[PDB]
Amino acid sequence: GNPLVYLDVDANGKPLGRVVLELKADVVPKTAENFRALCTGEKGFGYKGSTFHRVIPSFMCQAGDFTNHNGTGGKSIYGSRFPDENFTLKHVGPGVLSMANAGPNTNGSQFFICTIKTDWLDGKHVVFGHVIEGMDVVKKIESFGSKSGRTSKKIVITDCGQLS
Ligand SMILES: CCOC(=O)CNC(=O)NCc1ccc(N)cc1
Numbered sequence: 469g470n471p472l473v474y475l476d477v478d479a480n481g482k483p484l485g486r487v488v489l490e491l492k493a494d495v496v497p498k499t500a501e502n503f504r505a506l507c508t509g510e511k512g513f514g515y516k517g518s519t520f521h522r523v524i525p526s527f528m529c530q531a532g533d534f535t536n537h538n539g540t541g542g543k544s545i546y547g548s549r550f551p552d553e554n555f556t557l558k559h560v561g562p563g564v565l566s567m568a569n570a571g572p573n574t575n576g577s578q579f580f581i582c583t584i585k586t587d588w589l590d591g592k593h594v595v596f597g598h599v600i601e602g603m604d605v606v607k608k609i610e611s612f613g614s615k616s617g618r619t620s621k622k623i624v625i626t627d628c629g630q631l632s
Contacts (some may be wrong), residue, residue: 470597472631473507477605478547479612479621485616487581487602489565490630492595496553499567499575505545506532506577507628511542515577518555520623523613527585529606530568530617531625532578542577549574557595563606565597566587579604591605 471491473527477484491500504516516536534543544550551573559582565591568578575594583606599606612621 471500471504471506471630472600474628475507475632476508476627477520477609478624478626479608481622484608485602485605488600489597490600491565491597492557495556496594496596499548499594501581502544502546502550502575502577503618504630508533508630509628511545512535515609515625515628517623520609520619520625521553522617523609523619523623524574524615524617525610525613526584527612528580528584530578531578531623532568532576534577539559539578541576544576549576551575553592555594557590559593559595561585563603564595565599566602567596569593581606583607584598586623 470493473489475487493500509516520529520531521539522530533542534540562583564582565577567578568580612619
C-alpha cells in the first residue's frame with residue numbers, strides 16, 4: 469500500500485521524537501516516490517541532516533532544503549524540479565503534508581506540515597500525505613517558529629527513512 473516514512477527531529481541537539489508520514493502514492497505516486505526516496509537517501513542525497521528552516525505558528529512547519537540549507541534550494545530525485553502532479557488532495561487541517569514551491573511546477577524537496585487548515589493553498593501546492601503519528605513533535609516544532617518564519621531553535625531532521 470501507501471508508504472510510511474519517518475523523520476526523527478532534534479531541536480538544539482535534543483531529540484523531540486518521530487513524525488510518521490503516510491505518503492498518498494495512490495493519488496500522487498510521483499510526488500510520494502520522490503519524498504520516500506529522499507527519506508531513505510538511496511539516490512545519494514536526501515533529508516538526513518537538513519533543517520526545518522521556516523516555521524510560522526498557526527500555519528505550518530517547512531523543511532527539506534538539503535542543498536542550500538536556507539530555503540532557496542533542494543532538489544528532487546528526477547532533477548532540480550518536477551511538475552505539479554495534481555491538486556486532488558486538499559489542505560483540510562492540521563497534519564497535512566504538502567510540497568513547498570516557488571510557483572507552478574517547481575516542486576523540489578522542500579515540504580511543509582500544516583498546523584491549521586490552509587485552504588488558500590488548495591490548487592497551488594501539491595498535498596501528498598499526512599501525519600500518522602507525532603503531531604506532538606509537529607506542535608513542539610511550531611512552538612519554536614515566529615511570525616517571520618525564523619526559528620528560535622536549530623531544528624534538524626537527524627534521521628529519516630521508510631517504515632513500509
Ligand atoms: C506554505 C509553503 O510556503 C511556501 O512554499 C513558500 N515558498 C517558498 O518557501 N519557496 C522557496 C522554494 C524554493 C524551491 C522549492 N523547490 C520550493 C520552495
